[PDB]
Amino acid sequence: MMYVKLISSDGHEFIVKREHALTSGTIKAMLSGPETNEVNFREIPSHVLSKVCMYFTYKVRYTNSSTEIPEFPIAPEIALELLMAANFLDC
């Protein structure tokens, strides 16, 4: 398939399926307007951006499925940064 590279503030590069990344409308805008498949996030550190990618996989897998859906886990230590990241990314 097609992949995109998502780069955290500390320089970690996360390669995810394009379709998975397009879950976020914010990212969709970063790919079509303002290296063609890379996005740098000056504000999202790797311990947050990693969970976001896990969310994309989780969302794509369990949306519209008849399999019992598990809880998406969020450690308390990251809940606050993940909230701001999720808000920014609109996902």
Partner: protein, 104 residues
């Protein structure tokens, strides 16, 4: 059964899935399609353990129970530059801040 993986080397982390019944070698084909390096230039690890090309992912301990979309299992990857490969180095992610007073 699909299993969901993070293939990690230095500061690169690949999010991908595979069948529990697929082999390490088939997983090596996925990373070369992504990172453009042949299988014989790749080494895959579970923890500190080198994996055989012919073994299935389930035989290597990657099962649906332990490799979930919201909590993928980690595969280490090391490249052969010209010879003797390199030691496995997976860089860890950043540290969360101290819990705010109101959460502790």
């Amino acid at each position: 059964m699909d299993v969901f993986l993070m293939i990690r080397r230095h500061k690169t982390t690949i999010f991908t899935d595979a069948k529990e019944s697929s082999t390490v070698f088939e997983l090596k084909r996925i990373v070369e399609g992504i990172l453009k390096r042949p299988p014989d230039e790749q080494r895959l690890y579970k923890d500190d353990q080198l994996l055989d090309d012919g073994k299935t992912l389930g035989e290597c301990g990657f099962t649906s129970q332990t490799a979930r979309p919201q909590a993928p299992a980690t595969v280490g990857l090391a490249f052969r530059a010209d010879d003797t490969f390199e030691a496995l180095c997976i860089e860890p992610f950043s540290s969360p801040p101290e819990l705010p007073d109101v959460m502790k």
